[PDB]
Amino acid sequence: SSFKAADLQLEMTQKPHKKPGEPLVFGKTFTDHMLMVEWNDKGWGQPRIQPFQNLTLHPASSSLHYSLQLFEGMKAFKGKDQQVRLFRPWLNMDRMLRSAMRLCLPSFDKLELLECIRRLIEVDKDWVPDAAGTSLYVRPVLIGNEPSLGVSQPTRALLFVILCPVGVTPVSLLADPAFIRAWVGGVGNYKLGGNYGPTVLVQQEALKRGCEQVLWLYGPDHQLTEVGTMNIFVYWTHEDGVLELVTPPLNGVILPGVVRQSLLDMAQTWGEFRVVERTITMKQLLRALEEGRVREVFGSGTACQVCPVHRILYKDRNLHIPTMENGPELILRFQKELKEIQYGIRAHEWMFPV
Amino acid sequence: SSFKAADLQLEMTQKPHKKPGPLVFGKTFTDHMLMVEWNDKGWGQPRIQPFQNLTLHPASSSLHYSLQLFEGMKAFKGKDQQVRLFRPWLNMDRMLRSAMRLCLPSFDKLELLECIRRLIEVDKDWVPDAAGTSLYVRPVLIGNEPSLGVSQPTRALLFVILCPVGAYFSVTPVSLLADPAFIRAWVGGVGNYKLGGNYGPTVLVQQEALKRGCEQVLWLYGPDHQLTEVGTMNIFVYWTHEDGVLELVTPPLNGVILPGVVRQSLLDMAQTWGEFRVVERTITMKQLLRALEEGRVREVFGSGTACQVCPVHRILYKDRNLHIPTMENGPELILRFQKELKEIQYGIRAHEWMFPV
Numbered sequence A: 001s002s003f004k005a006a007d008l009q010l011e012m013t014q015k016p017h018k019k020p021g022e023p024l025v026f027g028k029t030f031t032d033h034m035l036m037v038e039w040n041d042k043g044w045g046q047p048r049i050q051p052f053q054n055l056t057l058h059p060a061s062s063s064l065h066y067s068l069q070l071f072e073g074m075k076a077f078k079g080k081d082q083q084v085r086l087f088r089p090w091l092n093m094d095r096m097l098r099s100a101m102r103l104c105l106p107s108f109d110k111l112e113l114l115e116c117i118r119r120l121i122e123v124d125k126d127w128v129p130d131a132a133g134t135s136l137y138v139r140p141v142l143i144g145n146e147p148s149l150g151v152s153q154p155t156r157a158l159l160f161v162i163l164c165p166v167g168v169t170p171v172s173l174l175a176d177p178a179f180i181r182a183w184v185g186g187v188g189n190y191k192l193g194g195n196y197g198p199t200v201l202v203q204q205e206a207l208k209r210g211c212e213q214v215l216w217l218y219g220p221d222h223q224l225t226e227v228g229t230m231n232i233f234v235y236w237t238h239e240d241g242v243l244e245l246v247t248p249p250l251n252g253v254i255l256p257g258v259v260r261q262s263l264l265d266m267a268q269t270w271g272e273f274r275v276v277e278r279t280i281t282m283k284q285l286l287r288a289l290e291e292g293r294v295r296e297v298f299g300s301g302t303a304c305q306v307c308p309v310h311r312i313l314y315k316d317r318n319l320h321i322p323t324m325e326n327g328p329e330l331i332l333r334f335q336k337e338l339k340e341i342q343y344g345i346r347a348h349e350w351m352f353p354v
Numbered sequence B: 001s002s003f004k005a006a007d008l009q010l011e012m013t014q015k016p017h018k019k020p021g022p023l024v025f026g027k028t029f030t031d032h033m034l035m036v037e038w039n040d041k042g043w044g045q046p047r048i049q050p051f052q053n054l055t056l057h058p059a060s061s062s063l064h065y066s067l068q069l070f071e072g073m074k075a076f077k078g079k080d081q082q083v084r085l086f087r088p089w090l091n092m093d094r095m096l097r098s099a100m101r102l103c104l105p106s107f108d109k110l111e112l113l114e115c116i117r118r119l120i121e122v123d124k125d126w127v128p129d130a131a132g133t134s135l136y137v138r139p140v141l142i143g144n145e146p147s148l149g150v151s152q153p154t155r156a157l158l159f160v161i162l163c164p165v166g167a168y169f170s171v172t173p174v175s176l177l178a179d180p181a182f183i184r185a186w187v188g189g190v191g192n193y194k195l196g197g198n199y200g201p202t203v204l205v206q207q208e209a210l211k212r213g214c215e216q217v218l219w220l221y222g223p224d225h226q227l228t229e230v231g232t233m234n235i236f237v238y239w240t241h242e243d244g245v246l247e248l249v250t251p252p253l254n255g256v257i258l259p260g261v262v263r264q265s266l267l268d269m270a271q272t273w274g275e276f277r278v279v280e281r282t283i284t285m286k287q288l289l290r291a292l293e294e295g296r297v298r299e300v301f302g303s304g305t306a307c308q309v310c311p312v313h314r315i316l317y318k319d320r321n322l323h324i325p326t327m328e329n330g331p332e333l334i335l336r337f338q339k340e341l342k343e344i345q346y347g348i349r350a351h352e353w354m355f356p357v
């Protein structure tokens, strides 16, 4: 079964917080309301939109002992006409449910949750900024809530959603084979809390070595998997002399991003160059770099969208990536086309109106 | 800048809770808990307070990015009604390593242990004394940053709860599913730390084991199908090796193995006896198979705090059920291990492994 948006209960706030006047630091500023839905042996209770408030959790809650937790991330955008739209939200709903099944957490109806999320954004519509490059970040979470120390499928769970208003400079990456984000047969291809905790120390290491993000390598052939919490793309002339955009395939160690899929879809549509999903090795990159075949390297993801890379520290070898000296033409094109779609300049099936 | 047991604040429950009389593991809790807060002004004062819910910001990094780690150790009440913790220093060592791995705040292991001692003291009447019973102690350290950025927490909570637990068993053996598709941990990963993130993903695997008529998961690693762990327990094999020497083998701490306190204790006990080879070496399924055909395997078992020492009698590997003659061999080793541990844990023999409350 599932909760229904028709059963939504609304509790407007009586202490509305002051909106930001000024820099928006990602994921630190929250809106006045939140979605909340509980599950137990009776199934799903009724969804409610209520004032933003703390969670109350039993000390034995399995969300805190055995990381029975998963999350999502998507953006709503306000056009000049003040119309708010969510970017490809159905894909997040699909991904959220796959995550839930992987952690033996309760299933729900994707279209019911999306509607609840729509209602929640509608209540807080004034929190959605409209300055250029600004958006509203939507964070759905599902956690197990069993008050028991046995490692087991939970009999209670909690689904909730909070919102943040959020506000092109290239980055350097540390590429060290010692660090492993995920493995074939693991859970790196699901957006589960457990995949993130262990990266915090690796990210501090990147900073100490003068880099900004982590380029996650995998396997004997040092495959480029992902960059920070973003998917990685390479625009180059491949060894066979063909110009292509390549990103790693979904073989278990890649989180299937929405921006990622969107970029593949966009480039495939254009039909101007080869667009493939194939592994990428450091060996291939060094060679392509020495032969001037790399045009652009970039990460993709909701929070930072499409972010260029200019440097990769591979062990002690400091490699210049000429992304910015190549425009970066593809990056700009993607950003321009995405911006048109996102802010309702060009109406498109990808957008879901709030 | 650790918290201090000298600075403990105590707050006794207004209305105590009625003890149990059928104790299911990890469901029943005691009257009090320990709680310590950390922030940019460091650690606050530890406190003992009535058992109560946590209040967390909905953005808490503990729930979004699994900034969470735990421990598990037992306290036992002997005939003399004295209560003792089994080798708690090892759990404190392990917890601090977990903390560091997750960039969570460092603390003083002896201060924490004194606070746990004070906490068990306060609830000492909850520690049962029937044969096979103990008190399970569950310390937890979680991140508590109200931010969606994946980052080093500037806030944290350290708490400890207690559960009286009953006799899990005479030893009843289990069946295992050995399917290499399921990978618990990877070299360079965090499988060797007691982090919450390592457990969530195993819930589905365990259901699959139950669907296929097995009771626990035998976690295999690498192209040569190394036996690493069984469920949430370390794995031991008692056999005559390929060189003709009777040995007790357990996989070494190469990164994909959680260094159990019971595991180390079985190694320490077996070495002290001096009666057979005691070694830490990779065990492959190919090795176990050849040893099972040539009749060289005596016993296979799991080691861990919750279930102490658990016999295995069947492994389902490549759709073929392999029989493990553990029970036919006594199981002598297991029974000897269980007896000595019991004597030590319940104070029958004095031993430096036990820490009095």
Ligand SMILES: CCCc1cc(=O)n2nc(NCc3ccc(Br)cc3)nc2[nH]1
Residues within 6 Å of the ligand: A149, A150, A151, A152, B072, B174, B216, B230, B231, B232, B233, B301, B302, B304, B306, B307, B310, B311, B312
């Ligand atoms: C994670 C520490 C607390 C804990 C939870 C839990 O579910 N289990 N289950 C076991 N043992 C089950 C088991 C029995 C025999 C073999 Br062989 C392997 C596993 N121990 C804990 N501990």
Ligand SMILES: CCCc1cc(=O)n2nc(NCc3ccc(Br)cc3)nc2[nH]1
Residues within 6 Å of the ligand: A073, A171, A213, A227, A228, A229, A230, A298, A299, A301, A303, A304, A307, A308, A309, B148, B149, B150, B151
């Ligand atoms: C996990 C979803 C929310 C989230 C958290 C977070 O910390 N980050 N950081 C990034 N991007 C940083 C970055 C910048 C450039 C490159 Br190339 C790679 C990563 N995105 C999120 N999202």
Ligand SMILES: *Cc1c(COP(=O)(O)O)cnc(C)c1O
Residues within 6 Å of the ligand: A073, A191, A226, A228, A229, A230, A231, A255, A256, A257, A258, A259, A260, A300, A301, A302, A303
């Ligand atoms: C969320 C995420 C991405 C990309 O996600 P989008 O769906 O494009 O926002 C990539 N990699 C990791 C590790 C992530 O957590």
Ligand SMILES: *Cc1c(COP(=O)(O)O)cnc(C)c1O
Residues within 6 Å of the ligand: B072, B194, B229, B231, B232, B233, B234, B258, B259, B260, B261, B262, B263, B303, B304, B305, B306
């Ligand atoms: C806790 C744990 C062990 C060892 O447990 P001890 O109680 O310290 O002996 C072994 N394996 C896994 C997966 C664990 O979580």
